[PDB]
Design a protein around this ligand. Structure first.
Ligand code: ADP
Ligand code: ADP
Ligand code: MG
Ligand code: MG
Lengths: 419, 213, 206
């Protein structure tokens, strides 16, 4: 009866539900087709069908209501919306539309929206008066996000080190510089666990580009939030389509005084798809990357803002270096000074089986006074003074043992005061 | 009624002004489009509309009156000036033009300047006799700019050190060599505070390239 | 059966000749309509004639006229098509008063060469052309009208100053698009608008 709950059901249960209804031969077909078939048969009974999803607008003028469960993949079960409804209710790409859907008549292959009663988890009339996102005035981050977890007390010190190396706030536009095989994937997973635990109210969204199918499944099971990803076998145009879907959805949520945190992986992979999709302008720069090709990633990355009126958009991205490619190096160079917090990883530290492989000297943040307190800020400065003479590798094992025998960061801070 | 005061108004107030006028669906759109829509509706009443900005000339020959509020960004609310008006009043890129603007007729998407009554905060006839900047003879700096602030008495000694390390005068062509993460941004901010305080008469302009929003 | 449906649908005077009737009957009725219209125009009245079809009308005229001893391409004599030219050219706007409006249909791609020669001589004789496309009709999109090919002369007198400029803006957008993609683009825009004025102000937004 309800579209959202039907997709969340297991595929094995989905076949059983359709068999007793009256349908046949639903076992050996894609799950998306099964949902369309079940809704088609259930529509004959005359009962109302509820549907919801993320709305996008095509270039022709009509739009479809994509579902975040299938990573915004086009399917027969997508809800079609006429352009006339767009005039009645001001809608743009990214917003969530929920309402009743009518059975598709002959000649059309998609369900049509009948009546909308919920826009962006709010009344449709109220959503019409929301101020656009681009008109909002950005500000520096001021809401400290405690990345350290005390109740878990796990053997991993990544959360404790991350706060000391570079505090993360709401609306940050930081990037992660991670060489290959340096624990980049687990670094994002640990951050996601703390966000889902310390700040359950904040909306957490994870976007992955050119990731293996088994890596996507593990991310969904581990991260307690909305995870959308595109596999490598999918075309480069699919990567562009999903990338714009995530940011547009986040912007609409920010307009409703909500905080959205986006874990991006990766800018280099994202810029790879953007360069291929954009047509050639007749001029090729160094590395085969056009000037206008990297304009799109700049728009996506720069959207991380702290709204003065209310809410914030936090974007955390990963940058790949020393991958043996030049294009990936040119992409990194233009994305150096665009961030608010840099987190540089070192392959050599990972070669010593010491984790997390974080370069404390290279890592840093801007305007850390607003995030931390007066007492906390001074303690961090004292720690950096001791670390700076030490090398990038010797600093980690020095910090790891100190944090290993201390319960919280406060206990570590008062220990350094003794010396 | 006046273009300059309308852009300085908050976006929240801008929507409310257009709603009572008669316009609709102004909330979910860019601020630049809202200003154009409000002026378009207000133009139907027949009341005169005042506009001003910085004039630039394109390569084709026509120009537009950019606004410094939007960082000179191209928009539908930019005032279009015909090349004929350029011959009547010698104008080049950079000068400020203020005057009445007529409603855009069918076929054009930009407002057109009707009559100009203020050029560079001066009478247009007087601005025509000004000498160009390139014919002026440069000289060394001779007007001392006191960068030190006494009334504030803040804990920061940057203003006091700057005067001792290197005095700054009017017409200086100095440069700052700043490594990354060396307080370069706050260095310019402290200088700006002293200039706006010690010398309010002097015009202060700040230009930033490739900076975060 | 087509004649009977036309009489029931059209609220006016409908006259037609069936295929079984001889070609001389087609000529007799064709001259009857135009001569009747001319007399009404002389009385300060406006007459509108819907002709269907010039190719069919020229077919009967060619057979009725006796052969002059010379046959041109397609078996159509030069004097044979003189009569349709007189009938079609009678559409005039009288300065003193009244007017005669003639709207005709031309058949193309019918598999006959003769029907092609007739169309060629009747290309530049019209004041407005309305070209239909079979490919558009194959897509189940109606009306199958080629917007780029269609046009009119001296449209300034008919439309107003404000209306004329809006049409020019629309043609600028349509021209880059193909003859088929232009229709579905126009159909959806007109579908959600009440009148053409509402459609015109919508295009002004872009
Ligand atoms: N916090 C951590 N603690 C212990 N081991 C880690 C940690 N993070 C990563 N690793 C090690 O890194 C390996 C996986 O690295 P990977 O995520 O593939 O690096 P990259 O993402 O740079 O390719 C695992 O075998 C794991 O043992
Ligand atoms: N005059 C000053 N007094 C105290 N601290 C300062 C001063 N100028 C800069 N800082 C410190 O520098 C940091 C910001 O440096 P930043 O402006 O980012 O350097 P850069 O512009 O070279 O990148 C702040 O955390 C601030 O504490
Ligand atoms: Mg990885
Ligand atoms: Mg700086």
């Amino acid at each position: 009866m309800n579209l959202t709950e039907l997709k969340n059901t297991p595929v094995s249960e989905l076949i059983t539900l359709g068999e007793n209804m009256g349908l046949e031969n639903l076992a050996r077909m894609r799950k998306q087709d099964i949902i369309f078939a079940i809704l088609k048969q259930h529509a004959k009974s005359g009962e109302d069908i509820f549907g919801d999803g993320v709305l996008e607008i095509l270039q022709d003028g009509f739009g479809f209501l994509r579902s975040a469960d299938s990573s915004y993949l086009a399917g027969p079960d997508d809800i079609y919306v006429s352009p006339s409804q767009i005039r009645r209710f001001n809608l743009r790409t990214g917003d969530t539309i929920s309402g009743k859907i009518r059975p598709p008549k002959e000649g059309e292959r998609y369900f049509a929206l009948l009546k909308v009663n919920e826009v962006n988890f709010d009344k449709p009339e109220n959503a019409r008066n929301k101020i656009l996102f681009e008109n909002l005035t950005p500000l520096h981050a001021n809401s400290r996000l405690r990345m350290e977890r005390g109740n878990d007390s796990t053997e991993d010190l990544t959360a404790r080190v991350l706060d000391l190396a570079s505090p993360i706030g709401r609306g940050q536009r930081g990037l992660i510089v991670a060489p290959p095989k340096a624990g980049k994937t687990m670094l994002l997973q640990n951050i996601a666990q703390s966000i889902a635990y310390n700040h359950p109210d904040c909306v957490l969204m994870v976007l992955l580009i050119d990731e293996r199918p088994e890596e996507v499944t593990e991310m969904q099971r581990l991260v307690k939030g909305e995870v959308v990803a595109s596999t490598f076998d999918e075309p480069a145009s699919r990567h562009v389509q999903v990338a714009e879907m995530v940011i547009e959805k986040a912007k609409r949520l920010v307009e409703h005084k909500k905080d959205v945190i986006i874990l991006l992986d990766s800018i280099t992979r994202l810029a790879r798809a953007y360069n291929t999709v954009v047509p050639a302008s007749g001029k090729v720069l160094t590395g085969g990357v056009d000037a206008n090709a990297l304009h799109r990633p700049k728009r996506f990355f720069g959207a991380a803002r702290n709204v003065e009126e209310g809410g914030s958009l936090t974007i955390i991205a990963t940058a790949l270096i020393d991958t043996g490619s030049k294009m990936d190096e040119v992409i990194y160079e233009e994305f150096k000074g665009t961030g608010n917090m840099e987190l540089h990883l070192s392959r050599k530290i990972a070669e010593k089986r010491v984790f997390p492989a974080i370069d404390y000297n290279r890592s840093g943040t801007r305007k850390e006074e607003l995030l931390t307190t007066q007492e906390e800020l001074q303690k961090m400065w004292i720690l950096r003074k001791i670390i700076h003479p030490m090398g990038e590798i010797d600093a980690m094992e020095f910090l790891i043992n100190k944090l290993a025998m201390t319960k919280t960061n406060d206990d570590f801070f008062e220990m350094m005061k003794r010396s």
